[PDB]
Design a protein around this ligand. Structure first.
Ligand SMILES: *OP(=O)(O)OCC(C)(C)[C@H](O)C(=O)NCCC(=O)NCCSC(=O)CCCCCC(=O)OC
Lengths: 75, 255
């Protein structure tokens, strides 16, 4: 159960997407239809799953699946 | 029955009523501080938290049920939906209330003509998702409450913990609470409240548009208002020290 798969599971659960269908390049807002509420939930869920704290400055950058994978991995 | 907890050393009594979807545990961020200046009375609203004997209620029935084991006299502080319950009691039993305090609350939650509030179709959409995907909805509601603030995420976490603290309320209770918010309109009757009346708001609160504050200042010239500049729907979570400071000052005006 790798980082990628875990991140994708959270995105899929949060936005309602089946996670086999979630693409690494997917944009939360543009592609997935996330609004500002969804993105808050999304970031909170990542912190939970990975037991970390993401400062507002990193959070603001995490706009795609890949960005989430990247941040989470290097920590 | 109704769950009540009394704590604290203070000479003045203070009843705390929580908002929709939550319970008395939401107060734990400030209750130690408040308990040093007041004798606190914390309540789970009928149907919510550990107050299980109940289904959907009218505002009137909710308030009466709560009143049953309330203290003889107290300042009544109601947050959001609790604010309506506090207001209802101040109106019908003014002798039990030394002062009325509402926090992030409106006398009429739904928008009307020239009256800012929650748009009826928004509320109906919500009541719907609730019936549908209940959590994702309760959980989005918690994020909604803290959005736009410097401490958005930890405050949402603190609210989530309250929710987790106890089993969730039945859907008919949740529903009934939305019915209250949808329909109640205390704007005119509250013109007549004679006890000290303090209204607190979050500048960033989407659920109670700040715009109502000047309108209420006018409609209730005898009332007083304070806005927390950087708070949303839960200013006591985001600004505990400022919030407690204001209540302590209120205490002194009640003598
Ligand atoms: O993040 P973003 O892109 O800026 O998105 C902002 C959104 C789109 C979420 C925007 O704020 C929006 O859609 N707002 C409407 C949301 C809204 O106001 N919903 C009201 C639903 S009714 C409800 O939430 C229950 C009533 C409140 C309870 C009263 C109480 O006692 O408080 C606990």
């Amino acid at each position: 159960s790798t980082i990628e798969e875990r991140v994708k599971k959270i995105i899929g659960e949060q936005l309602g997407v089946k996670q086999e269908e979630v693409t690494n390049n997917a944009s939360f807002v543009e592609d997935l239809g996330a609004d500002s509420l969804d993105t808050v939930e999304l970031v909170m869920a990542l912190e939970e799953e990975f037991d970390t704290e993401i400062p507002d400055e990193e959070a603001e950058k995490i706009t795609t699946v890949q960005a989430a994978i990247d941040y989470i991995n290097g920590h | 029955n109704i769950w009540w907890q009394t704590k604290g050393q203070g000479n003045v009594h203070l009843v705390l009523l929580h908002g929709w979807g939550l319970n008395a545990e939401v107060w734990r961020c400030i209750d130690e501080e408040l308990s040093s200046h007041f004798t606190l009375h914390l309540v789970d609203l009928p149907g919510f938290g550990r107050s299980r004997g109940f289904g959907a209620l009218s505002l009137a029935d909710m308030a009466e049920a709560v009143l049953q084991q309330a203290p003889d006299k107290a300042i009544w502080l109601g947050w959001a939906l609790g604010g309506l319950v506090a207001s209802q009691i101040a109106l019908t039993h003014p002798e039990r209330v030394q002062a009325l305090v509402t926090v992030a609350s409106s006398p009429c939650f739904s928008a009307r003509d020239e009256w800012p509030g929650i748009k009826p179709d928004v509320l109906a959409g919500f009541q719907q998702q609730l019936s549908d995907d209940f959590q994702r909805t309760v959980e989005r509601f918690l994020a909604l409450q803290t959005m736009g603030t410097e401490t958005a995420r930890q405050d949402a976490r603190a609210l989530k913990k309250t929710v987790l603290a106890l089993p969730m309320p039945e859907v008919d209770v949740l529903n009934g609470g939305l019915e209250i918010l949808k329909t109640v309109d205390l704007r005119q009757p509250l013109q007549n409240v004679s006890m000290p009346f303090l209204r607190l708001y979050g500048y960033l609160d989407g659920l109670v548009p700040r715009k109502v504050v000047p309108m209420l200042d006018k409609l209730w010239p005898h009332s007083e208002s304070y806005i927390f500049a950087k708070a949303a729907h839960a200013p006591f979570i985001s600004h505990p020290a400022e919030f407690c400071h204001l209540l302590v000052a209120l205490k002194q005006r009640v003598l």
